[PDB]
Design a protein around this ligand. Structure first.
Ligand SMILES: *[C@@H]1O[C@H](CO)[C@@H](O)[C@H](O)[C@H]1NC(C)=O
Lengths: 438, 49, 49
């Protein structure tokens, strides 16, 4: 038998339904989203960290020319100086009085500590949701890992579960994401090669051990104006350090919908958003015929001390006089009140207590006990405590959220206005008939 | 706490005095056996228990 | 739960009430004034005989 329903995407909060199949008894069915993984497809763009800006030992040629060729090193800056006279510890370093030539070279490379203190740039595409479902039907449990695309069946082979598409696609990650030591940031990094000095992405490579490293750190090699052998260089700051100083807060703290971000496949975990349409092909062996289910001859619902709250704040007692001892599924047939218990034991006569959580000020829902329906009626007090540690099991409607006393007052006033309108039109009808007769 | 499915008070031999004069019996049906607060919601009559 | 009421100053005579927090069961509460003590601040003037 196929059953199509819609569940909330909140972690926990079991969604309970009663599968009714002709003469195959009511079957309890609750679905719990025990986990969620929004995993986008990520493309690694580059890696970055601090640069080392190593300056090689200067080369001097005296009474000669020392022009330099291009190099493949990261941001290789070479400059020729023609009026030098270097001095080591030991005096002048070459014979030629004024026609000397110094080669100043400056290229950057990855710092030795970039194996940890590095950032990875990722392009993030659309994300796919994978939910872990604890589905119990009858007396059987099932744990499934289902994609929420709309066509892929569940992991379990004995029952088929197809989770339709989310009502609203969330995708907390922007198109460009930076991961640094397990912290996830939504930063608009430069493309590969479209880099600027001082900003994040000064140095770029495909990997940390890659030899193809490209950088545009703004190195200026000044003229040596001192006695000693020196390479006067000036440079922009590391964009990794500048970005680290003002990275803001990561997405582990700023993600909406209570997402909980990890980095190993870069998934967002336990995001409570939207609704999952879900269809279950329950096997025929789970159902039992209505002859083997006990029949409730009469049932009466009496409910006392109802509190509409996130917790199960209401308690109702069903008095029953069935004909045979056995197990019934108990169900609440409203979208505003949910029962804590899904299956109870039934003696030939007696009473069972059931805890329910609701959001309406009125408890006017319908409770079924082996398909026998009864109507409860009470007034649910507002809770006294303001803050609770667990989320709400039910959503808030409009018809339910307005109390019966308030509904009576508004309907009485609106009906009074409509009644005066009706009387006015009736008096005009009567007066018009009288004056056209006369 | 136990919940009361049905309660009805019948009071016999009441007498208005300083002493606890008057015996009201509550006939009750409740689902769960337990302990229960009992109270009089009038400023004029006060219960002993 | 902050509950405010008014008790008489009579020694003995337990004053009974219910504290009824919404989400919880009604809870009994009785206050009895066991003793009272009007102690004025006294200044000694003298002793005579
Ligand atoms: C599931 O097993 C329990 C074991 O106690 C039994 O009472 C119950 O009737 C079974 N459910 C069905 C639908 O047969």
């Amino acid at each position: 038998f196929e059953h199509a329903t819609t569940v909330p995407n909140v972690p926990g909060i079991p969604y309970k339904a009663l599968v009714e199949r002709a003469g195959y008894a009511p079957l309890n069915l609750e679905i719990t989203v025990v986990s969620s993984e929004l995993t986008p497809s990520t493309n690694k763009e580059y890696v970055t960290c601090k640069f080392h800006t190593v300056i090689p030992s200067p080369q001097v040629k005296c009474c000669g020319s020392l022009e330099c060729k291009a190099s493949s090193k990261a941001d290789y800056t070479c400059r020729v100086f023609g009026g030098v006279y270097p001095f080591m510890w030991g005096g002048a370093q070459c014979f030629c009085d004024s026609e000397n030539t110094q080669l100043s070279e400056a290229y950057v490379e990855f710092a030795p500590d970039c194996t940890i203190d590095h950032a990875v740039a990722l392009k993030v595409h659309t994300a796919a949701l994978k939910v872990g479902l604890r589905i119990v039907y009858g007396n059987t449990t099932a744990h499934l890992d289902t994609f929420v695309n709309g066509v892929t069946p569940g992991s379990s082979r004995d029952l088929k579960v197809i989770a339709g598409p989310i009502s609203a696609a969330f995708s907390p990650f922007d198109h460009k994401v930076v991961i640094r030591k397990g912290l996830v940031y939504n930063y608009d990094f430069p493309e590969y090669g479209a880099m600027k000095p001082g900003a994040f992405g000064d140095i770029q490579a495909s990997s940390l051990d890659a030899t193809d490293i490209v950088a545009r750190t703004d190195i200026r090699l000044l003229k040596p104006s001192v006695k000693n052998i020196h390479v006067p260089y000036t440079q922009a700051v590391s964009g990794y350090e500048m970005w680290k100083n003002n990275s803001g807060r990561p997405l582990q703290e700023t993600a909406p919908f209570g997402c909980k971000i990890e980095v190993e496949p870069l998934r967002a975990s336990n995001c409570a958003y939207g609704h999952i349409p879900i269809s279950i092909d329950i096997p025929d062996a789970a159902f039992v015929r209505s002859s083997e289910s006990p029949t409730i001859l009469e049932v009466s619902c009496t409910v006392a001390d109802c509190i509409y709250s996130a917790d199960f704040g209401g308690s109702l007692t069903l008095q029953y006089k069935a004909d045979r001892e056995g197990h019934c599924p108990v169900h609440s047939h409203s979208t505003t009140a949910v029962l804590k218990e899904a299956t109870t034991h039934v003696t030939a006569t007696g009473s069972i207590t059931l805890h329910f959580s609701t959001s309406s000020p009125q408890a006017n829902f319908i409770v079924s006990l082996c398909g026998k329906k009864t109507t409860c009626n009470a007034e649910c007090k507002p809770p006294a405590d303001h803050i609770i540690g667990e989320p709400h099991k039910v959503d808030q409607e409009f018809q339910a959220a307005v109390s019966k006393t308030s509904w009576n007052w508004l309907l009485a006033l609106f009906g009074g206005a409509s009644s005066l309108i009706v009387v006015g039109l009736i008096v005009l009808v009567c007066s018009s008939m009288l004056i056209n007769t006369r």
